[PDB]
Write an enzyme that holds these catalytic residues in place. Structure first.
Site, PDB file in Angstrom:
ATOM      1  CG  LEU A 160      10.476   1.898  -4.663  1.00 30.54           C
ATOM      2  CD1 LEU A 160      10.703   2.314  -3.207  1.00 30.54           C
ATOM      3  CD2 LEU A 160      11.402   2.670  -5.601  1.00 30.54           C
ATOM      4  N   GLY A 165       0.789  -1.222   0.000  1.00 27.79           N
ATOM      5  CA  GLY A 165       0.000   0.000   0.000  1.00 27.79           C
ATOM      6  C   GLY A 165       0.827   1.281   0.000  1.00 27.79           C
ATOM      7  CE  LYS A 218      10.321  17.803 -12.019  1.00 27.75           C
ATOM      8  NZ  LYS A 218      10.656  16.374 -11.889  1.00 27.75           N
ATOM      9  CB  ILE A 241       5.687   8.640  -9.486  1.00 34.35           C
ATOM     10  CG1 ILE A 241       5.729   8.371  -7.983  1.00 34.35           C
ATOM     11  CG2 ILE A 241       4.261   8.910  -9.949  1.00 34.35           C
ATOM     12  CD1 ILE A 241       5.745   9.594  -7.074  1.00 34.35           C
ATOM     13  CD  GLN A 281       5.235  23.575 -27.763  1.00 34.86           C
ATOM     14  OE1 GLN A 281       4.995  22.571 -28.462  1.00 34.86           O
ATOM     15  NE2 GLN A 281       6.442  24.166 -27.738  1.00 34.86           N
ATOM     16  CE1 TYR A 286      11.953  19.189 -22.367  1.00 34.10           C
ATOM     17  CE2 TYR A 286      10.650  17.905 -23.935  1.00 34.10           C
ATOM     18  CZ  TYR A 286      10.846  18.401 -22.648  1.00 34.10           C
ATOM     19  OH  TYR A 286       9.928  18.117 -21.655  1.00 34.10           O
ATOM     20  CB  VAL A 318       6.311  -3.265   6.683  1.00 33.43           C
ATOM     21  CG1 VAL A 318       7.365  -2.872   5.658  1.00 33.43           C
ATOM     22  CG2 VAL A 318       6.767  -4.492   7.482  1.00 33.43           C
TER      23      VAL A 318
HETATM   24  C1  LIG Z   1      15.270   8.258  -1.541  1.00 40.27           C
HETATM   25  C2  LIG Z   1      14.224   8.092  -2.605  1.00 40.27           C
HETATM   26  C3  LIG Z   1      13.775   9.213  -3.263  1.00 40.27           C
HETATM   27  C4  LIG Z   1      12.780   9.095  -4.214  1.00 40.27           C
HETATM   28  N1  LIG Z   1      12.353  10.224  -4.883  1.00 40.27           N
HETATM   29  C5  LIG Z   1      11.392  10.119  -5.877  1.00 40.27           C
HETATM   30  C6  LIG Z   1      10.922  11.235  -6.580  1.00 40.27           C
HETATM   31  O1  LIG Z   1      11.338  12.360  -6.363  1.00 40.27           O
HETATM   32  N2  LIG Z   1       9.959  11.091  -7.544  1.00 40.27           N
HETATM   33  C7  LIG Z   1       9.476   9.856  -7.870  1.00 40.27           C
HETATM   34  O2  LIG Z   1       8.643   9.730  -8.736  1.00 40.27           O
HETATM   35  N3  LIG Z   1       9.906   8.753  -7.177  1.00 40.27           N
HETATM   36  C8  LIG Z   1      10.852   8.868  -6.187  1.00 40.27           C
HETATM   37  N4  LIG Z   1      11.258   7.747  -5.524  1.00 40.27           N
HETATM   38  C9  LIG Z   1      10.413   6.518  -5.683  1.00 40.27           C
HETATM   39  C10 LIG Z   1       9.123   6.510  -4.854  1.00 40.27           C
HETATM   40  O3  LIG Z   1       9.381   6.545  -3.466  1.00 40.27           O
HETATM   41  C11 LIG Z   1       8.324   5.258  -5.197  1.00 40.27           C
HETATM   42  O4  LIG Z   1       8.231   5.179  -6.611  1.00 40.27           O
HETATM   43  C12 LIG Z   1       6.919   5.263  -4.595  1.00 40.27           C
HETATM   44  O5  LIG Z   1       6.946   5.691  -3.251  1.00 40.27           O
HETATM   45  C13 LIG Z   1       6.347   3.837  -4.580  1.00 40.27           C
HETATM   46  O6  LIG Z   1       6.966   3.052  -3.567  1.00 40.27           O
HETATM   47  P1  LIG Z   1       6.499   1.544  -3.404  1.00 40.27           P
HETATM   48  O7  LIG Z   1       4.977   1.570  -3.321  1.00 40.27           O
HETATM   49  O8  LIG Z   1       6.938   0.710  -4.590  1.00 40.27           O
HETATM   50  O9  LIG Z   1       7.256   1.000  -2.100  1.00 40.27           O
HETATM   51  P2  LIG Z   1       6.984   1.246  -0.511  1.00 40.27           P
HETATM   52  O10 LIG Z   1       6.634   2.657  -0.187  1.00 40.27           O
HETATM   53  O11 LIG Z   1       8.176   0.737   0.240  1.00 40.27           O
HETATM   54  O12 LIG Z   1       5.718   0.308  -0.180  1.00 40.27           O
HETATM   55  C14 LIG Z   1       5.825  -1.003   0.284  1.00 40.27           C
HETATM   56  C15 LIG Z   1       4.456  -1.455   0.775  1.00 40.27           C
HETATM   57  O13 LIG Z   1       4.455  -2.875   0.889  1.00 40.27           O
HETATM   58  C16 LIG Z   1       4.012  -3.251   2.150  1.00 40.27           C
HETATM   59  N5  LIG Z   1       4.536  -4.561   2.581  1.00 40.27           N
HETATM   60  C17 LIG Z   1       5.845  -4.942   2.672  1.00 40.27           C
HETATM   61  N6  LIG Z   1       5.852  -6.207   3.131  1.00 40.27           N
HETATM   62  C18 LIG Z   1       4.587  -6.638   3.318  1.00 40.27           C
HETATM   63  C19 LIG Z   1       4.046  -7.844   3.750  1.00 40.27           C
HETATM   64  N7  LIG Z   1       4.803  -8.799   4.313  1.00 40.27           N
HETATM   65  N8  LIG Z   1       2.679  -7.958   3.823  1.00 40.27           N
HETATM   66  C20 LIG Z   1       1.847  -6.914   3.501  1.00 40.27           C
HETATM   67  N9  LIG Z   1       2.404  -5.739   3.061  1.00 40.27           N
HETATM   68  C21 LIG Z   1       3.745  -5.608   2.971  1.00 40.27           C
HETATM   69  C22 LIG Z   1       4.406  -2.092   3.062  1.00 40.27           C
HETATM   70  O14 LIG Z   1       3.567  -2.152   4.185  1.00 40.27           O
HETATM   71  C23 LIG Z   1       4.089  -0.928   2.159  1.00 40.27           C
HETATM   72  O15 LIG Z   1       2.699  -0.666   2.156  1.00 40.27           O
HETATM   73  C24 LIG Z   1      12.237   7.842  -4.534  1.00 40.27           C
HETATM   74  C25 LIG Z   1      12.700   6.721  -3.856  1.00 40.27           C
HETATM   75  C26 LIG Z   1      13.685   6.844  -2.892  1.00 40.27           C
HETATM   76  C27 LIG Z   1      14.162   5.631  -2.176  1.00 40.27           C
END
Ligand SMILES: Cc1cc2nc3c(=O)[nH]c(=O)nc-3n(C[C@H](O)[C@H](O)[C@H](O)COP(=O)(O)OP(=O)(O)OC[C@H]3O[C@@H](n4cnc5c(N)ncnc54)[C@H](O)[C@@H]3O)c2cc1C
Ligand SMILES: Cc1cc2nc3c(=O)[nH]c(=O)nc-3n(C[C@H](O)[C@H](O)[C@H](O)COP(=O)(O)OP(=O)(O)OC[C@H]3O[C@@H](n4cnc5c(N)ncnc54)[C@H](O)[C@@H]3O)c2cc1C
Ligand SMILES: [Cl-]
Ligand SMILES: [Cl-]
Ligand SMILES: [Cl-]
Ligand SMILES: [Cl-]
EC number: 1.14.19.58
Lengths: 496, 494
Positions: free
Chosen positions: A330, A10, A75, A343, A148, A439, A39
């Site tokens: 991720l 989530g 942005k 994203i 554009q 660009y 988590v």
């Molecule tokens: C330092 C950093 C900077 C970033 N900056 C940008 C940015 O500027 N712009 C951009 O577009 N992207 C950026 N990103 C990427 C961005 O954070 C992610 O694309 C976005 O937050 C999606 O994360 P996620 O949902 O894949 O992972 P997470 O946020 O880690 O979500 C993991 C989910 O899985 C759940 N989970 C894990 N294990 C279990 C389990 N056993 N059972 C049930 N649930 C579980 C957790 O509870 C959580 O809900 C950045 C990333 C990092 C690390």
């Protein structure tokens, strides 16, 4: 025909997926999202890429509705500070170059040109004068015209997840708050269900892995191979803060990427606060040193502010779709946030998932074509990012010295050889879809200092009047816009 | 800067080049064209690709001015006859597919739906033999990109017309034979030596000598890469056949599959152009002439046949030292998708973009060469797809086409296509004139069809797409009622 999707996680990825699937298929798909109550989500990911308006349009959400509600901002581009000359900067804006007599304004700038971004892009002025991209009556400044000047957004990472979960749940997504303890597999290695601590087995036809770096289905269950990019892009950690602006009204309509001593730092202005982080390599600087460097720069004396230390998994899964499981977010792949692509990767993964949606037959050729697209998507950005470090002229620390000589991906050498002669174009940038257009490649090269030795020879045979009248036209349109447009904060205040 | 260009050859290639260079640089470039008074132009090359409007626009020429003057007609697309099922046909039109709820009409056709007839307005226009313009000159639909129709024209007349354009603009014209090409101590061309006008020198030389490749191959030692292993058609026999009824004029080229190749029909204002493209491994030059005559001109032995040996492939590099090959000297594929004149236009457009300064830049030249290579390789691959999609298997020729080796990358495109439609990411990725709809249209028309519809569509409301199919059907009805015939409109602008 398949019926049900089970999403695990989530974060922004989980809830984007859940939302988009419901938007796409409505009552012709059953969706369940399971997420841990203990988590935490990553906590970052606050800037977006120019494609994101399409995601919100698809959902049926106007920016006036969703943006205040995610506490967001505008942005218009990214300001790159201190990468080459110290104290120096340029913008990488979301704006296509105009074309005069067959050549873009960058070619003409080299021949008859004031910095590159400033001469060629309206957006440059809007950033300097801290303008909103809309008039108070809500009309776009271009006044599609949205293409554009494909501006994107900043938003609060907590709020966007909160907002999209509500969107998805309102549309019939079953929500389960629990830990998956075990992932079942049938005799063919296909996922049969996820076993939770308190809700038993949750089964479905298609499983979407949105568990973050952990890759709980795609890597830990299915044995997907992860390809690291640390050889060409060593940054492997981040430290993040949430820093209140002394003056909320003083709100920049852009992200700032500032080169630091062993990495770089982001500044993302939100409606109520800034987001800040230092992306670094721990080969060159320790986690405390980085935290100390960060705090010193953006939050002196503010030790009440808790730092969030993150270990990054940089690279991509060989395949993000294996059997009946697709990794999104991720869990699929990640590159450092230098060009705000995380994203974007999610959105593109989900849009292409809908296009490559399986029928009851699970066609391997269609899956294979999906995997190719996701691979190209990330590999293109990876190459584009290495180009940032190769173009950076600063050489003042072990980190920056090592960036200069570090190995490159295949293909970049040729792009650099070309660029010393003339500008890259549609035929010489990375050829498969990776979000970025020509660009963007050109703008980074010129901003950072990778400049053709001489102007394009054809231009000396040509009348420079039409291009000079265009530079003047841009300069005048810029003058008029900053006079007529409200500030970034002003406009956002008026729609809260 | 460099000052002067010497072009050798006065076919369509030479004169397009001369014209374009003057249009681009006006008095900031000196141009001389040298052409033989006794070595004939190829005599063919009468259909064009969708890009061609830009060439004429760049020159400052409206179609109303140039077309009647080149005795031309309209090309709304190509009709492919007899390639798979016998007596069967479909159109490959110059028209982009509409998109409904994120999927193009081809996808929807597979789910809820002939293909060309259901998806393209151009299909109706072709069947009803319409002009793409109303009598007041307004386009039937910028709106010109949405239906990027091209042209047919007389090959003699276009060369004649363009030479006048170029000469009016200060191109020096020399009618003579080049007997020797001089080279300096670096192997760069220093001049061309003519039989009666001495040495003609300049900074840049453009080789427009046709298959001959007098500068690029015979002087510079450029290597030619043959495509005969995958596209064996090596000869053609051509005719100029008067239409019994001039008024009966089709706004499209016809490509009809024959026993050992295929035949073109190109309707011009006064006459048709006809030719049989074949492989001499399967049929002799006279057998082919007999088969052609029998089909399009029975008993008309007064009509002289033009037999041509084709050089199929491309130079490794079309730009070597100070010499650039343009036209048949650079590359050629059989005219199955009317690309010869496109190759010229694109070569010339990119020559202006890659124009050398006094400091010659090997990197810029190398980038030019990559584009020209991709341009031809992309089409080559697209053409092999025609032979792989053709389902007919009735002669040694068609049997052999089925098993012949393919270029790299096509096997993958065929595996994909049996599963789902090709798209922007899976067609040939570099610029080669053609877009996705062209790749799709050929697959669907020839019979390379996904096993099932795209599964996502079953989860979606079909109403918007069905309303679009109806909208197309109704717009088609209205257009054929309102538009004049191809001949009618052309008559009104003569
Ligand atoms: C330092 C950093 C900077 C970033 N900056 C940008 C940015 O500027 N712009 C951009 O577009 N992207 C950026 N990103 C990427 C961005 O954070 C992610 O694309 C976005 O937050 C999606 O994360 P996620 O949902 O894949 O992972 P997470 O946020 O880690 O979500 C993991 C989910 O899985 C759940 N989970 C894990 N294990 C279990 C389990 N056993 N059972 C049930 N649930 C579980 C957790 O509870 C959580 O809900 C950045 C990333 C990092 C690390
Ligand atoms: C059978 C066939 C069908 C085709 N159909 C199409 C089609 O439908 N659509 C399309 O777009 N293209 C088609 N093409 C391609 C088309 O013919 C060419 O793209 C176009 O005619 C340009 O030809 P060219 O100028 O390169 O060669 P050529 O017409 O052969 O010109 C050669 C020129 O070089 C000159 N020359 C040669 N040697 C010397 C020398 N020693 N000294 C001085 N001058 C010399 C000759 O006098 C002549 O002027 C077809 C080609 C063939 C063979
Ligand atoms: Cl271009
Ligand atoms: Cl990112
Ligand atoms: Cl798409
Ligand atoms: Cl051709």
């Amino acid at each position: 025909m398949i019926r049900s999707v089970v999403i695990v996680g989530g974060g922004t990825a989980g809830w984007m997926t859940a939302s988009y699937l419901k938007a796409a298929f409505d009552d012709r798909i059953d969706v369940t999202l399971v997420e841990s109550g203990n988590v935490r989500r990553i906590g970052v990911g606050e800037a977006t890429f120019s494609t994101v308006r399409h995601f919100f349009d698809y959902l049926g959400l106007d920016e006036r509705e969703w943006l205040p509600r995610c506490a967001g901002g505008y942005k218009l581009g990214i300001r790159f500070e201190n990468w080459s000359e110290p104290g120096e900067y340029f913008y990488h804006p979301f704006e296509r170059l105009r074309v005069v007599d067959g050549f873009n304004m960058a070619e003409w700038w080299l021949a008859v040109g004031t910095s590159f971004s400033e001469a060629c892009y309206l957006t440059h002025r809007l950033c300097e004068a801290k303008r909103a991209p809309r008039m108070l009556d809500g009309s776009l400044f271009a006044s599609e015209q949205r293409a554009q000047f494909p501006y994107a957004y900043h938003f609060d990472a907590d709020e966007v997840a909160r907002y999209l979960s509500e969107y998805a749940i309102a549309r019939g997504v079953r929500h389960v708050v629990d830990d998956v303890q075990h992932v079942g597999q049938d005799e063919r290695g296909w996922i049969s269900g996820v076993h939770t601590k308190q809700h038993g087995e949750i089964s479905g036809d298609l499983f979407v892995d949105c568990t973050g770096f952990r890759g709980l289905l795609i890597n830990q269950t299915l044995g997907g191979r992860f390809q690291s990019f640390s050889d060409v892009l060593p940054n492997n950690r981040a430290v993040a803060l949430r820093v209140p602006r002394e003056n909320d009204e003083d709100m920049r309509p852009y992200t700032t990427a500032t080169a630091m001593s062993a990495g770089w730092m982001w500044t993302i202005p939100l409606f109520k606060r800034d987001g800040n982080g230092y992306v670094y390599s721990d080969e060159f600087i320790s986690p405390e040193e980085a935290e100390r460097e960060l705090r010193s720069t953006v939050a002196p004396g503010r030790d009440d502010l808790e730092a969030n230390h993150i270990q990054m998994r940089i690279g991509r899964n060989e395949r993000t779709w294996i059997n009946n499981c697709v990794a999104v977010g991720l869990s699929a792949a990640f590159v450092e946030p230098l060009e705000s692509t995380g994203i974007f990767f999610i959105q593109h993964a989900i849009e292409q998932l809908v296009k490559h949606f399986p029928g009851e037959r699970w066609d391997p050729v269609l899956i294979s074509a999906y995997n190719e697209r996701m691979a190209h998507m990330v590999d293109g950005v990876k190459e584009f990012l290495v180009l940032h470090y190769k173009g950076a002229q600063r050489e003042d620390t072990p980190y920056w010295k090592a960036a200069k000589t570090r190995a490159m991906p295949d293909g970049l050498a040729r792009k650099l050889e070309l660029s010393a002669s003339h500008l890259l174009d549609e035929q010489t940038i990375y050829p498969y879809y990776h979000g970025f257009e020509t660009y963007s490649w050109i703008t980074m090269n010129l901003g950072l200092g990778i400049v053709p030795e001489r102007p394009r020879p054809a231009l000396l045979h040509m009348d420079p009047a039409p291009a000079l009248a265009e530079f003047e036209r841009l300069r005048r349109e810029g003058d008029e816009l900053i006079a007529a447009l409200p500030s970034c904060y002003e406009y956002l205040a008026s729609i809260q």
